[PDB]
Design a protein around this ligand. Sequence first.
Ligand SMILES: Cc1ccc(-c2csc3ncnc(SCCC(=O)O)c23)cc1
Ligand SMILES: [Cl-]
Length: 329
Amino acid sequence: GPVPSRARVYTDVNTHRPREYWDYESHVVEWGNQDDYQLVRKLGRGKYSEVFEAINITNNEKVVVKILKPVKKKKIKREIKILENLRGGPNIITLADIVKDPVSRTPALVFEHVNNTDFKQLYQTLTDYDIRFYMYEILKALDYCHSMGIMHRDVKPHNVMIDHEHRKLRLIDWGLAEFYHPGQEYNVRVASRYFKGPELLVDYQMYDYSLDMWSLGCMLASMIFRKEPFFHGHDNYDQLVRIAKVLGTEDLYDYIDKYNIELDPRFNDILGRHSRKRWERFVHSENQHLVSPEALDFLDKLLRYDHQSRLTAREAMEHPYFYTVVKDQ
Ligand SMILES: Cc1ccc(-c2csc3ncnc(SCCC(=O)O)c23)cc1
Ligand SMILES: [Cl-]
């Protein structure tokens, strides 16, 4: 069997809370009034939800309504409980209301509206300072949810809403998020392929908050090198290959060895042998204005195979890469 693992930080925050904090099945939802909201237009669709721009007709404010499709209620209750636990935290999307058809019982989450610019258009216009600023806003959200015992597990640009004119960032879609309990074996089928940490790709189930810091590193790399997504595999196996062509295969094998992970024999054929590339190799004239020694040092400390060796969100905020941001706060 593999070697056990426990989070370096916030290990027992849920152990100490009363049962009701993390026991989302027991939670009793307080429902608002469905007739306060009028749907205006469809914004998009998840695999288990559709998202609408809407208007709160009592105050004419814009809101976003996410109608959740007939799925197991346990999944819905977990997202609600997590959103309520984190409400008011820095850069965490605000759940303003929960409503349901009084006759058909179909449930809908009402969120504060963010005037988002789609990242595929926004990112290519961000300056070096913008990237540092928004990375720091995400770290605030992640340190907050991690300190409250919660892993996001789907950190990616699609789940980061940015009202750019107002320098306003919110981390959204807590539908994959989960409470951390030390020693628990979690589903590795989380996050999006390009942002999956190596622990997920090698089926190491005893992961923790540091999963989110890998995803963050992936985002950072795509922003400062202007290469989105940075690690572009065509399936989970190829995804670890793309990581290994950058981080190198030796550190990957050290990781697997350290945790006594039984690596699928298919992997050895396709992983090959790759040196670790210097982060400088990805710098060129089209991204150089976004790259600094600080940026590369910070990136290097997020994108580590060993989840235990990655910066925590709070350590990351201490990094010199953010020196000018912090004075601005
Ligand atoms: C698929 C999709 C469609 C629209 C939006 C969206 C655009 S602006 C905006 N402003 C606040 N929220 C959302 S989504 C609801 C929050 C959540 O699911 O956690 C959006 C986000 C995702
Ligand atoms: Cl953390």
